[PDB]
Amino acid sequence: LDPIDXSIVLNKIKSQLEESKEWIRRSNKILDSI
Amino acid sequence: VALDPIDXSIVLNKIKSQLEESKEWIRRSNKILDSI
Amino acid sequence: LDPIDXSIVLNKIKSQLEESKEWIRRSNKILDSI
Amino acid sequence: RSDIEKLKEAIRDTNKAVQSVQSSIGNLIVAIKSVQDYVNKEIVPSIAR
Amino acid sequence: RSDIEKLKEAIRDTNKAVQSVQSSIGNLIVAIKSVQDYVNKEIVPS
Amino acid sequence: RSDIEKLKEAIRDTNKAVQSVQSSIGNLIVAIKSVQDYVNKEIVPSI
Numbered sequence: 001l002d003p004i005d006x007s008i009v010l011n012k013i014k015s016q017l018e019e020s021k022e023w024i025r026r027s028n029k030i031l032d033s034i
Numbered sequence: 035v036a037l038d039p040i041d042x043s044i045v046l047n048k049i050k051s052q053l054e055e056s057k058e059w060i061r062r063s064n065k066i067l068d069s070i
Numbered sequence: 071l072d073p074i075d076x077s078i079v080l081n082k083i084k085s086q087l088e089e090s091k092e093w094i095r096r097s098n099k100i101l102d103s104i
Numbered sequence: 105r106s107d108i109e110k111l112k113e114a115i116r117d118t119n120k121a122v123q124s125v126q127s128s129i130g131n132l133i134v135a136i137k138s139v140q141d142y143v144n145k146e147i148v149p150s151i152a153r
Numbered sequence: 154r155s156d157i158e159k160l161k162e163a164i165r166d167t168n169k170a171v172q173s174v175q176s177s178i179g180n181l182i183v184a185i186k187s188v189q190d191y192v193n194k195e196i197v198p199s
Numbered sequence: 200r201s202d203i204e205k206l207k208e209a210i211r212d213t214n215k216a217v218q219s220v221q222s223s224i225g226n227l228i229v230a231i232k233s234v235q236d237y238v239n240k241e242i243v244p245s246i
Binding site: 001002004006009010012013016017019020021023024026027028030031033034 | 156159160162163164166167169170171173174176177180181183184187188191195196199
């Protein structure tokens with residue numbers, strides 16, 4: 001049988017997860033100023 | 035051997051629904067931030 | 071065939087999730103003071 | 105109507121959105137557990153017989 | 154540089170963090186569904 | 200104890216909850232990857 005594959009999907013979650021972390025980095029950056 | 039198919043459609047259904055409810059909660063948060 | 075195991079990763083997800091639920095509980099309790 | 109009130113209510117909505125995400129992750133754990141059990145209870149003995 | 158304006162920008166950033174998390178969840182559903190489709194059509198009749 | 204100070208700390212806590220969710224998602228990827236690896240290395244050769 002053909003091996004199962006969603007490497008494209010899982011890679012998209014990794015990429016999206018990095019964008020989420022950057023948004024939190026922006027938020028904590030502003031709170032440090034308050 | 036004759037094998038029963040794998041089933042969690044109801045399990046996955048809640049996630050899809052719990053996801054949509056989370057989308058609407060962010061929408062309301064951003065909506066309050068307009069009036070500020 | 072050996073049975074499939076990620077019992078360790080599944081437990082880390084559980085602990086991180088309950089850690090998340092506690093940070094929200096503190097956030098909502100801080101907003102209760104206002 | 106106050107700005108502090110508006111800020112407070114926005115975080116409430118944001119927190120609810122996070123809580124809804126926390127439930128979805130909880131069911132994702134269950135979804136993966138269903139797969140693990142199906143492999144070890146339906147597939148493994150099938151190939152062993 | 155207003156205190157209130159700084160608080161709004163942090164919530165807006167936090168919301169975008171949540172939105173990308175929501176996109177990730179949606180893709181985890183697709184991933185798990187791909188596993189169910191793979192055993193129901195490739196493993197079970199094999 | 201000012202209202203602004205409370206709002207800040209509440210957002211600090213919300214961000215930490217989101218960071219914790221972010222970790223759990225990274226591990227869900229690992230979990231799914233381990234299921235993929237078991238299928239292609241234990242199920243496929245046997246079947």
